């Protein structure tokens, strides 16, 4: 109780805590303005709560509210204080969290009441992190509010520390909100300034030159042809000339012009000017007279040093000092007094005079010094190295060549002018002199790479874009980048492998590169932007141009460092390198696409016959820009070959319309490719018919191509789905009618001529503007939307919300006026929907008030503020659109939300186009047509002939069995859920251009290609299904006069495609196209009509026809539409939606998945598999579809590490050896227990040897088959051990089996002797030397141990199969296979000496083998259970208590009785594990088993006979309950693979065929090579050994365990849903009159399978009651149709449920009759029962609301959700009479 003043940012901030306060009877006064000391906001206030408040309270307000002001700060105090806590916490890597504290006189330092921490994931963005922090702090304020008003929380002071930030501190980071934490940290690390350690150099260039000369005086400095000089002579000459220059008057920062050629005197004069104190200005004598005059006039140089040949080029403007005059050189060879400084100029160079006038770049000494100090240790320039002065001295190229080598002791070499251009002579000179390391420009290096050089060791290139690295030398290639204004180069990269775009490299020492947008803000890693250079590389600026210097060399307003603009578009790579993308002024619009020509260069140079490529943009008289490609080649390549080569990876608008063959590109003085000295030439089946000329003109007006040809494919000339429609529109301006599909079947002008010369079919019927009526009709789409909206009244699943971001200079009132004008313009924004009877009617309102909202939020507060505004709409009120403007701290978010019935895609485009037109002050013409006319026309068209022909296609296609796709989902909810999330996948522009080019070349679109990829992906996830089905969204614009109207026109189409894996990818593309063309031909059919024409019922937890949606959007029309972002409020309309968008020349694929079906890991793995499939199909066009795989290598390794890979070495000693050892060790220990016989180890060994010696004597070799048909007794074990010691394998035969099976086994195997008991000798018919087991004969007197002749590869026992097919075969198992399983079970389950083992199962199965040979290793005792106590549970339970058994192997069919006959009576002991193999263990028996015996462990085991008894184990914990009871990971030395029909690994969730491999695999089938080869097939996953195909269908889990589904030979396809018969078994225990049951899928005559639930009961139950009991929870496609009565299910030998031995109303009251009559009038059935299901008699969503309309016609409001819950008239009756209230009034006078 109290009155709380809630101060915050805006009105709706933190609605959770406000509602929590209002629920606790507390009044909340929301305010956002500044609170005055004496106002109405402070009078009568008990508490004050602040949540990101934008103001500061006064001192008196805090004084009058001590301990009453509670502040909420989403940060871990004292860290991150002020503004933007989460952002600076993620950036500065501080411990994050949330805090709820008090407010003192100081800000953000009060006593902390509550303080908690929070963790931020790496994949979460800053916005998601801020949302999570706000949610956590709101939950904390909700949870700890009753602890503050009650004084429970004890305030504590804060700690001294933390950080502090302000408001503008984030101005440098306004474009980093949509980035993740990992990307933000990477950007922080790769852009952090280095530590204060790089000390600057306080020395110039001449000082370092003198220091180097003093070290290596006699070393040769510069060489010129035949003459060379040393460092000493060069230094002396430079000193003399500098003395002579200083005698004239050379002062610091003064300019001295130099016009000399490449020789010694040039470098001499350069060094002299450097030592004298001035800066040398190089002027190339080869320059034209105009450029030389300009460089002489602009430069303030009064002294010129030139020869007598180039003297007249000076025109006598400066003091000429000839460098050949002896009087022009002094005599003092000593060095000049150093009077220079590092900030003084060293050289002044001019740029190119192309773009404007030449600019005098001023470079200081420290710039060059740093460049040389970086260039020397980086490449290791030794004094023995040689360089070349290749580039002219008027560029930085010569500087790097001269100074770089000159500052390390190298020897420069002057390249001859006769051998400069001729690269052959240059290579010869380099091989002669031994040049190691020098710089060459881009073109020169790319042309020199063809030369065979053997002396080069380091060749550096730069200036232009490097695209060729293939060379003929052993030297390293280095790419350099750097403008003239930033001292030669700034970044260097070492080329080591081919790249599609060669990066420029990392910056040098004391140099940094920034990627900034147009607003001087930082850009994330991977985003293009303008390049900025900072550091020591920057010079002084431009000569005599201070304005341009300040315009270029700028000062950042945020940081303050002096940066330089390079005007180049670059991008930051994640590895630290920088990728050059081109210039910012080269971006040209080529046929509606702003692209860069440079990107076309690496795709044209890939041709083997082309060396150099230059793509440029030229302008024609029409004003359009076209592309021209100049290529260097020895021979001219035709235009068609180049077009075909470029159309493989690039789209049509990226192919140059002209190609020019050149011998060599003209290079300038610096070596760059002259883009202005290129030659431009023009050129040299043409139509003839008037109609052909008209079609060519129309294609020219649409596609924007000046010349169109006849055989020119529309898709090969830049045509998408949009323009085609426009094309049709243009045709409808001439009178020709063309459909959407026909253009895809007639792509050439010849086929268009063939089509337009047959029939007319031109229905020139205008939309026919309707008159002013009171009520207008509605379309079927609007009818469907109204039906869906009235189903869930407060639903926002069909609310379309768009957001735009405008700058702070845009007025909100203007936006409001534009939106009001748009509402008053279109009638759709002024329409209401009503229900007059059973019809949905539309009413027009002439005026509607727009609900415009204006709020003041923040950048990080947008998602929650928009979600708070997403509220359901009322279709009976106008308008149906809400608009709001949220003013953040740097931009304004304009959001608008409408209903899907009024706004779709093209309507959104039109709205964006009109909004941009209104915001630009433009007059729009009134609309001509309305939605009402289209509705009338479409309602009247439903009775025409075209509608019948279009609906006949859907009636014929959707009449048979439809393929039911199955996605790897979790447990589907019982109802239709809509909660979902969205992931994003990015296809880079390269693969996008590749896909588009492939589609255009093979006569396809990108839409059809993506559709085929999605279909192949769904097929692969559906175990390579032949047919798939999925929904798509088209245009729906049926009438031509509807391309400029507002309203929902889109229609959904259920495409049913066929995928043939045996064919190639191109064949599947063609099949998908041929299946999509007729579907798009009949696209104008309502989805409700398609559902009704399917003749298929619909009532479940799945969609009607499809669960996968596929949508695609190309390029937007206007720029405002590109700025519109669609906001999703966590609503998934289907199970999985794939929305492709063509954005930023790349593809954005939105995966809209459901949360109850997919989490985050599964959807990420699915996106990865889709990416892998796309990458496989983009390169494997001719490859087969079955060769493609989904599961990537990472997921395979993860599954192999989590499931398989269990190599554990086990001893190879046979069981016979261990038995002999433990018998000779402990002879007096009990080994066998049989009623009163307690045979030890010694007596057993002797009795076994007495028979083994006789078997060896009567001829028994290894690998022989000895039959044994003895029952459970000591003699059986003795005979088994004797046969094992003899060498042969024992074959168990059931004595109670008929003679036919025994004779068949004897005929199939071929044994040599049969061992049997005394009553079982006659049954063997006395075959071939039979021996009695009970007789005293056939027992030798020798009791010694026979030699261990057997090997681990011999057969241990033979196990015939159960004979499910009819012909059983014996399985051959080796000793190693059994021994490995035994050792694995002993390691997982220790059977020590005090422990025991029971022999329960019959010896005619592999399960009994583990009991027989399990007590061997562990010195245990086996209790041979009597055969009479096999089915008696009491005797087994008593023997377990008596003998004290620890390990027991049970059957999932005998465990139920074994537990029911106990019910927890007496207590047992020593019992540990309970092994259960054979069938699937249920889940409703584990808790009962643990309640009966809470001192045992449950182990679900699985393994066929051919896999050596068991193969997989799973320990069911006592505290864990698993719904699907899995089989667990494989045992040690086991490998279980879930493969598919094509030999491909299945992912998580997708069911596949299980196979087992390992060293414990059986040999094969006895005397059956065909079946062995069929069941044991070699798999490519295991290069050696072999893998057994179990023939079962199972699936994995999230952890790695396998869930046994069922046998592959038994498919479950009931009607159209694939649900196993395991969920029906859950209602068995819930019932009382039925004991045990079973459900078996049966077949009839027509093939339609029908269920038949066999159950056991005391009496026969009514079929109607049995169906009513199952109808409560299970639907109709799961209830069996037949029910029979059985006393007890027949069991087999093992004790399992034999699946092959089984025998083959009226209404009362008034409301009931009313609902029955209503259903009879709507559904169309005469007699309506009181318990009949709504969906049972053809009840669709359409008729579901027809019932509600009929009810409302009788004044009854019924919700469709209530009908979905109560479909029975017996569950709808108690909800109708509750809407009648009799109210009367008084009347008396």
Curated annotation (Swiss-Prot):
Keywords: Antibiotic biosynthesis, Ligase, Multifunctional enzyme, Phosphopantetheine, Phosphoprotein, Repeat. One of its GO terms (molecular function) is phosphopantetheine binding. Binds 2 phosphopantetheines covalently. GO terms for cellular component: cytoplasm. Residues 3-145 are annotated as: GART. The modification O-(pantetheine 4'-phosphoryl)serine is found at residues 721, 1741. One of its GO terms (biological process) is amino acid activation for nonribosomal peptide biosynthetic process. Belongs to the ATP-dependent AMP-binding enzyme family. Linear gramicidin is a pentadecapeptide antibiotic produced during sporulation. Two module-bearing peptide synthase with a C-terminal epimerization domain, which is probably inactive. Each module incorporates one amino acid into the peptide product and can be further subdivided into domains responsible for substrate adenylation, thiolation, condensation (not for the initiation module), and epimerization (optional). At the N-terminus, contains a N-formyltransferase domain that is probably responsible for the formylation of the first incorporated amino acid. Large multienzyme complex composed of 4 subunits; LgrA, LgrB, LgrC and LgrD. This is Linear gramicidin synthase subunit A. It comes from Brevibacillus parabrevis. The gene is lgrA. The chain holds residues 2 to 1802 of 2273 of the full protein.
